[PDB]
């Protein structure tokens, strides 16, 4: 059919959010463009987890403002993501931060209700990221650029 970037993006983001909220790995290895997707998810695990560790108290403050002012967290999160990019600056650091915060929201939703699904949150994040930054993502080689940007090439 069509739109491999959207599919691939949604699979990487859905699984990361699903792992974080539940604490379990999907197993279910690969499918379609697995090698890039496998390395992107592992990069997202390393960086995503680190961002949430390093800015945990800040995320709690954002979460509180998110809950109090408006009803739906997924709709509200979309407003935030658009505003984040409203200055016209786009880079992988911002993209990974938004995904990391989405994972934070996903945990929060599973705590207030254990049966909540993560798909609406993930597809909404993927919607913002793919639609609004389609050509930019393509220019960075999609998730291959994401992997490399966050890949440390010399430990020394």
């Amino acid at each position: 059919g069509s739109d491999e970037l959207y599919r691939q993006s949604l699979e990487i983001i859905s699984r990361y959010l699903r792992e974080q909220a539940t604490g379990a790995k999907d197993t279910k290895p690969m499918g379609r463009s697995g090698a890039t997707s496998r390395k992107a998810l592992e990069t997202l695990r390393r960086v995503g987890d680190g961002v949430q560790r390093n800015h945990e108290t800040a995320f709690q403050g954002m979460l509180r403002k998110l809950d109090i002012k408006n009803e739906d967290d997924v709709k509200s999160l979309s407003r935030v993501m658009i505003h984040v990019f409203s200055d016209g600056v786009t880079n992988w650091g911002r993209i990974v931060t938004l995904i990391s915060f989405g994972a934070f929201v996903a945990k929060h939703l599973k705590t207030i209700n254990q049966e909540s699904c993560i798909e609406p949150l993930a597809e909404s994040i993927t919607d913002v990221l793919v639609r609004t930054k389609r050509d930019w993502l393509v220019k960075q080689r999609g998730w291959d650029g994401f992997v490399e940007f966050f890949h440390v090439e010399d430990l020394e």
Binding site: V47, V51, N54, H55, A58, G61, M62, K65, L66, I68, K69, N70, R79, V80, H83, V84, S86, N91, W92, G93, R94, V96, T97, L98, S100, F101, F149, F150
Partner: peptide, 23 residues
């Protein structure tokens, strides 16, 4: 305004991430 305040904090976090990469 709540949207700006949240976006501002994410931008600061993202800038932190970018500074880490090229160090």
């Amino acid at each position: 305004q709540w949207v700006r305040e949240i976006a501002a904090g994410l931008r600061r976090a993202a800038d932190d991430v970018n500074a880490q990469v090229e160090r």
